[model samples]
Target: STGSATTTPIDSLDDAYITPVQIGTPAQTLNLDFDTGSSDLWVFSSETTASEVDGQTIYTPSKSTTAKLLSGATWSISYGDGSSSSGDVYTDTVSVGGLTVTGQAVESAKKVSSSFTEDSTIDGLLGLAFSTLNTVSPTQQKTFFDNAKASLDSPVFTADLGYHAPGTYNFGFIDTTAYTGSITYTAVSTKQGFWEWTSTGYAVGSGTFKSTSIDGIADTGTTLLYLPATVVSAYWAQVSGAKSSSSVGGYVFPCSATLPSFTFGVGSARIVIPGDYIDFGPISTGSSSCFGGIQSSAGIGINIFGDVALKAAFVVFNGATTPTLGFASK
Candidate 1:
């Protein structure tokens, strides 16, 4: 058994990544969002919708006595910019950062969207993908790293993700000081239940390395870093004033320009991504027009590597049974 948590980055360009789970029976802490591009762990509860609840932290499974209610089961999810929620399912006793998983399932929202009731720093979503992308219906749910990966200690899970600080999320092992040289494994596909992989090409500052292979998705519930609009117009055509606007949708730029570092490739390991982490900020509040941690997956057909490429390394989703991914360099 293992589990470690931390996470935190809900702002300053890191956009998501909260992490503080533990639910049900005298527990209830919330802060969720550990997404990894969706599966379904859902939350914000007391069966939600009391005028769409706002400053989150709900999950009242009728005051958990070990909650239960999965009677007919139900759930709904929807994202990809559309935002949605829906719920009812319960089982309870989750936990993270000390692994525990008792019955688990959990859903519970009962209506969300209005951008999840105006954000309030996220209080739901803990997906971690691959429970067959579970949206629970007849019965699908798993993930709190699939019900605690066989009592963990190695079914694998790691992430480190931070840019505006605080990161971690190990569970089962591989925390060799969070990361550094030597790791680079790759191959995962899960046929689209995400944690997908494929890169072997990319480079921009320190130019030329584009060997071309791309396919992506290491999405920590996405927040930029899409690619392949010819590699996001070759990294905003080396940014001089950058463009692609349609009223501010993708590549903006000129918050004093000078951004560049991007570098991908993982088979021969490269990673990089620094030019102030692609300038991504200010497209509005005191805007000199910035907004870009990379973008344009040509209208999102899947090439995400989000949180600007997992805040540049230290990944490793493995999930054993041969589902490899491991990166490194923190």
Candidate 2:
């Protein structure tokens, strides 16, 4: 039971933000970037030249008749914010919803600047987090879940970020009828290529904050959620009158009521995080005041639980069996 798709917000370039998918099924929209850190699947090619490709979304393997190219092997990627891209290497037939997965192996870049290629509705990038930072090697390349993980149907993959309501991300299975089975999981501590864990403490209502235990790491390439400053001041001290201001580059908080259900245990598993996702948005620091979903970055080795705490939970990344990360219930 894996079916849900709605991420079409294409407009925001350079700093990065782009979406649009329709890979395979008589579909080929492509123009993505919903990266949960990394797990490559790129695009942008028309041989790349509109000044090295700007504002992305350029895949015209002669208009696909099932494209294919990967003779010598080549691909380059660099991010951390300095966005970079290079290409060459193909094997097409992608498909998304009904989930196809033919030869797969994308990444066609040929040079792409940052600003996600001029934005205009971005044009490529879909790395659903989990990585050995792979630059494609097994003799040059082999990922599209390493050849569709033996015909998926459940090797597991599910992401559901319903904030504005329509943020599902399914892959493989898990639909437990939209959850309530009390699902909770956490146990993968690899390190560097991300996929981390360790939180043991954090609560708000009853007020348990124990110095803010943390060892976090969950980044869908980051969209906010970088706790640490005493767990972002003990989660804005339970909000009711939360203060502080500023935007995008730091400091945020604002409350007009509502801000308590913030949990996070990890070892025994408890995640809860709704209060309008801890009230975050452009609301400035005045009129109605908004923005405040825990942010302080303290030591910052990347303590992100981005995608607003992983859309509640049901993430699974096996890395073909070795690197492991599994959570349940969607």
Per-residue lDDT of model 1, residues 1-330, tens digit only: 898989898887777879898898899899998888888888888878788887888988888899989899898888898899998898989888878899988889889889888988798988887999898889787878887888887998888888889888888899787777788888988987888889999889988897878888898888778888888898889999889898988889889888989889998888998988777778889989888888888867888888877788899888998788888888
lDDT of each: 0.86, 0.63
| Best candidate, lDDT | 1
Q: What C-alpha lDDT, on a 0 to 100 scale, does residue 2 get in candidate 1?
A: 93
Q: Runs in model 1 with CA error above 4 Å?
A: 1-32, 37-54, 67-101, 105-118, 124-143, 148-199, 203-208, 211-237, 242-252, 255-282, 286-288, 295-318, 326-330
Q: lDDT (0-100) at residue 314 of candidate 1?
A: 90
Model 2 alpha-carbon drift over 4 Å, by segment: 1-34, 37-54, 63-104, 107-121, 129-199, 203-207, 210-237, 240-281, 284-288, 294-304, 307-322, 325-330
Q: Candidate 1: what lDDT?
A: 0.86
List of clashing residue pairs for candidate 1: 45-59, 143-146
Error of 1 at 41 (Å): 8.7
TM-score winner: 1
Evaluate residue 235 in candidate 1 and report its C-alpha lDDT on the 0 to 100 scale: 82
